[PDB]
């Protein structure tokens, strides 16, 4: 701590599309959060303990393009809204939070870390409300604790009038569950 | 290219730090005074000058990016020195915080003007002065970010 983040783009529309079909990505990977994209929407995928997890709502059941072609998902849990592939070669993994901190920091796709107060297992209030447009694209992003440990993965925004007051997330425990789950 | 939120400045007499917050490049009056800042289009004057709070500010220079004020009330601060060292500090209140590990005043020299960050990397305050018992800085005075917001 303090939690600081930065973003780096690595592909544009045409490279992404070609890569989406060919399913072969030869670029180098770095970081613990990958800005991921399909032919329809773009979001994030967080690497926690050797596995690149993301929101099933975005990745669906797709494969991840890699240097050795497409990689099938390791886990898929439609109910918990999770999917995970082995973390790409080069990524760095976060580790689950072992301190039960009630103060969480959400990392957005623009590499911003905004504070949120854990309101209950899979919900937390934004200390400073933001437009829903600000959170768009940030699904599957990490919800960190003061020490930089994975508490959850951003899932949906709790908003009204187009302004987000809170956020729903997938508690890291559901991850350990999904893995143990026959899915 | 990459942009910095913290500029390392100099006035011949001394070197210290400035921190861009809310589009303004803030630093301590005891370093800059009412001096103007250098620019490739000539010197630019202070947008804000406040001797009473030891605060002066010019419009953020080039190659910089503004820092976001803190909104979590966290008291576990982090001080960034002119050498890019992060010194964790415990907030004792408003404008004072105690280092978790005291260090020779030298280690904090030239860092006045730099930021006091919270666990989200947001600006909590501006490092104003080091409080040192016998050459060992154990605490630091700082300008809370609200003063800057109130000065704007």
């Amino acid at each position: 701590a303090p939690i600081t983040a930065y973003a780096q783009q690595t592909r544009g529309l045409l490279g992404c599309i070609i890569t989406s079909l060919t399913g072969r990505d030869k670029n180098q990977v770095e970081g613990e959060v990958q800005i991921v994209s399909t032919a329809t929407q773009t979001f994030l995928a967080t690497c926690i303990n050797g596995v690149c997890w993301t929101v099933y709502h975005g990745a669906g059941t797709r494969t991840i393009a890699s240097p050795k072609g497409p990689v099938i998902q390791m886990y898929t849990n439609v109910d918990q809204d999770l999917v995970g592939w082995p973390a790409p070669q080069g990524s760095r993994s976060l580790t689950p939070c072992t301190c039960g901190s009630s103060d969480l920091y959400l990392v957005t796709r623009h590499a911003d870390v905004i504070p949120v107060r854990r309101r209950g297992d899979s919900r937390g209030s934004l200390l400073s409300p933001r437009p829903i447009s600000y959170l768009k694209g940030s699904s599957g992003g990490p919800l960190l604790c003061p020490a930089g440990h994975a508490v959850g993965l951003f899932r949906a925004a709790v908003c009204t009038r187009g302004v987000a007051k809170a956020v729903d997330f997938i508690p890291v425990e559901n991850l350990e569950t999904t893995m143990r789950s026959g899915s | 290219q990459v942009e910095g939120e913290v500029q390392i400045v100099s006035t011949a007499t001394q070197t210290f730090l400035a921190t861009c917050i809310n589009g303004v490049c803030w630093t301590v009056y005891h370093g800059a005074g009412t001096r103007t800042i250098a620019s490739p289009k000539g010197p630019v004057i202070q947008m804000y000058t406040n001797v009473d709070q030891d605060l002066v500010g010019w419009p953020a220079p080039q190659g910089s990016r503004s820092l976001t004020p803190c909104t979590c009330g966290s008291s576990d601060l982090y001080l960034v020195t002119r050498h890019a060292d992060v010194i964790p500090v415990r907030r004792r209140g408003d404008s004072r915080g105690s280092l978790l590990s005291p260090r020779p005043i030298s280690y904090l020299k030239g860092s006045s003007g730099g930021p006091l960050l919270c666990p989200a990397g947001h600006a909590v305050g501006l490092f104003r002065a080091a409080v040192c018992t016998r050459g060992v800085a154990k605490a630091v005075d700082f300008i809370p970010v609200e003063n800057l917001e109130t000065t704007m």
């Binding site: 783009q9 592909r11 490279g15 989406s20 990505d25 670029n27 975005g58 991840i64 | 190659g63 890019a84």
Partner: peptide
């Protein structure tokens, strides 16, 4: 057929404050 999810960027948390090199 559904295309592969492609990595088009990254966010790095491991970075620490640093003096931006010159040149």
């Amino acid at each position: 057929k559904k295309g592969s999810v492609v990595i088009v960027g990254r966010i790095v948390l491991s970075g620490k404050p640093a003096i931006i090199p010159k040149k």
